Subunit: 174 residues, 3 copies
Amino acid sequence: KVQELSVYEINELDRHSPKILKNAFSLMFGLGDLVPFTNKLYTGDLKKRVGITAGLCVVIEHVPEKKGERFEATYSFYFGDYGHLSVQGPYLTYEDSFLAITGGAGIFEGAYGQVKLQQLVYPTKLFYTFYLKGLANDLPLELTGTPVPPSKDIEPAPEAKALEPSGVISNYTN
Amino acid sequence: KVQELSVYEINELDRHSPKILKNAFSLMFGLGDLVPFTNKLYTGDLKKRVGITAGLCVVIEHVPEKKGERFEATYSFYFGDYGHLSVQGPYLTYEDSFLAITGGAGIFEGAYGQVKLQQLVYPTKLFYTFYLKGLANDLPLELTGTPVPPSKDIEPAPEAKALEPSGVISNYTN
Amino acid sequence: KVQELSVYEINELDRHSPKILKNAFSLMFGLGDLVPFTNKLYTGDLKKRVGITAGLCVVIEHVPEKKGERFEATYSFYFGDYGHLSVQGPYLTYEDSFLAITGGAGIFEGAYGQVKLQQLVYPTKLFYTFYLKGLANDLPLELTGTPVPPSKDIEPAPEAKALEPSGVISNYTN
């Protein structure tokens, strides 16, 4: 059975990310550049903060015909006390992509499948669709609220940005 | 059911790859050294260019008794519109190894298993064999032709290096 | 079914590890800092040397309240001829956590599940409890001896520190 889970990842310019480690001999990103990162994570209904993403983007090549970059990513999605999701695959700054679910822990132990990566605003808003298989349980009501249709002007609920209890999960990751 | 898939990885020196981020205080490779890389990927029968490899090699330690290096490599294999497989494991410059497949996306969504890595020319020609498990369907007939005899002399079909229609899969990754 | 497999990762400091790539804005650890690493691995009963751990620790943030760091880790455990296991998990130097099992090779082909990481002595002794699913068979007996309850004063048996035959598996990884 497939449980579709969607979140919103936003860089609110407060976690020192992304951090650029420059090695390519070019004013544009190129192989050599490494970009560690860590942004916040809010539920798909934008009412709650669940955790953060954490990981590493490796630059593969700038794509000028597409006015964009090519990173190879391996990173996690943290959902507080519930557990986390890990992924591996392509992140194209210019289009939408699909990454592999390499596994999970917690309520996400044994997770597999693919996850959709939709950009919205570069480099601050991305929407994801986890076509999640492998879990032993139905997901938490607080993580499955009807998603908010993605667009450039989406904003987490004021309470979630404000970290008020109603807008967060227990031990939300920060 | 286990499906077997074999491709050839070739460094044709046109992707600026690999990049050596030398950090170990030796002329030899050692821990601290990181190598982002991306080579070309061709079908096992070498008839069609399907895509590239892309990711990172982490130097673990040089191996004196073997005239070689032990890397811990995390990267993916991109097959154009078909999708991709992610992987994690040991790359030994002096011997063949098996790297674990961590997941896939597209026709490889749900993939799991292991892959053998054979180095034909260090480090410009490589030959793998995935033992793919988990695929919902049978592999595209165009991906599973008899391969070419592993050797330091292998070369892609002319139509494939030339990127002619009959030498490439649709939207082969680049 | 789950096949619990515990192991000890002893850092005896003879592998130039942890190498520290210090790039963060801050003096203490922070995003940007990278720590490639490799330690020794022993069986749960500390009677045998099986091989090594190899991979990368990416710093996500310093956690001052906890006088410790948050890392996002992607590494592999090597068990000689039995193969290896790979992972993606949060490493928090100040508290136990769980890692996703991204896969395995050799006898570990098909591996999935989660692993509990318990640090016993920072940064030297660590203890893992892998709730290991998917394997084809029961694990070989050499790897399933009764594990030693964790403690900050544990040390591997003598036979193994010395790499004597009765203390190592065949072709243990180094």
